[PDB]
């Protein structure tokens, strides 16, 4: 089940760092080839099973997913750290990448969010709820090849329930629902997604400057949102004012929004 250690090769240098621990690119030995592969690697120094058990739950729920618009998991390896072995996503974040690349087009941002909306229309036929959908999370493999990326928030619905109930946050990609009642669902996740659309048509800038959480929500609860991004078409607008939508129940879920992107791409 778990990946063997001797096949594993790590570079030195750290991808990027955080509590959990590293990222680091590595390579893993096939039969034949070698799969360069992301490792997150846990800094579980004090050897804390809470810390372990979170590496261990987002492994669990990647293990459930198979789609081209999602990272795969490859393994566990049980070595030095606990280590989740993941299929590597070379050009990185979504929002630094558009940060460093200008010149990328309208045409080329829409592909990229319709990859997403491919994929999070798979995570709610699944019944997976994100949780933390945003520009830093969506991993591309090329320009023109985008992969959702950090489940560690994410939860498995139950068979009879529609949402998460928390107990507890990046408030700037909240849904009102979230901040007031503590309700996850797909629908949440497709404000998120609205989020991250306007992120991706503003070239990776960070949503609502310089504001506090307390103000967003202040702002929103006024019915202001987020302006249209300079480029970004109106129809590309339109579709993240939807995903804005205060009433969870009028608010579209991710087959609507896949579909609204769809035709637009091919059609337009
Ligand atoms: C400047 O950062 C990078 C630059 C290039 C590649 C990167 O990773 C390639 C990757 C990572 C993973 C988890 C799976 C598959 N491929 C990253 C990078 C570094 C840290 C994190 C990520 C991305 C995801 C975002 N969450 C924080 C953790
Ligand atoms: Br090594
Ligand atoms: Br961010
Ligand atoms: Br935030």
């Known amino acids: 089940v778990y990946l063997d250690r001797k096949l594993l090769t790590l570079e030195d240098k750290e991808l990027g760092s955080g509590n959990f621990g ?15 592969v992301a490792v997150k690697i846990l800094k579980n120094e004090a050897n804390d099973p809470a810390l372990k058990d979170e590496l261990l739950a987002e492994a669990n ?3 459930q997913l198979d789609n081209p ?3 795969r998991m490859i393994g566990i390896c049980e070595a030095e750290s606990w280590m989740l072995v993941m299929e590597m996503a070379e050009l990185g974040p979504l929002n630094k990448y558009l940060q460093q690349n200008r010149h990328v087009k309208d045409k080329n941002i829409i592909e990229l969010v319709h990859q997403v909306s491919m994929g999070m229309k ?12 945003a520009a830093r999370n969506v991993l591309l493999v090329t320009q ?20 998460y109930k928390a107990q507890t946050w990046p408030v700037k990609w909240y849904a009102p629902e979230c901040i007031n009642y503590y309700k996850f ?32 929500t202040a702002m929103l609860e006024k019915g202001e949102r987020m302006g249209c991004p300079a480029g970004c078409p109106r129809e590309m607008y ?4 939807l995903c804005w ?4 129940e009028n608010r579209p879920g991710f087959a609507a929004v896949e579909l609204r992107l769809r035709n637009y791409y091919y059609d337009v």
């Open 69 to 71: 618009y999602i990272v």
């Open 245 to 248: 939508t205060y009433d969870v």
């Open 238 to 241: 339109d579709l993240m004012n």
């Open 122 to 133: 798979y995570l709610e036929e699944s019944n997976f709820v994100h949780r933390d959908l």
């Open 185 to 216: 669902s797909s629908k949440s996740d497709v404000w998120s997604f609205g989020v991250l659309m306007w992120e991706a048509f503003s070239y990776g800038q960070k949503p609502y400057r310089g504001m506090k959480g307390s103000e967003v």
């Open 22 to 36: 590293t990222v680091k690119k590595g390579y893993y030995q096939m039969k034949k080839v070698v799969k360069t």
């Open 144 to 163: 023109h090849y985008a992969k959702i990326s950090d489940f560690g928030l994410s939860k498995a619905l139950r068979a009879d329930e529609n949402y």
């Open 61 to 63: 729920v990647m293990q």
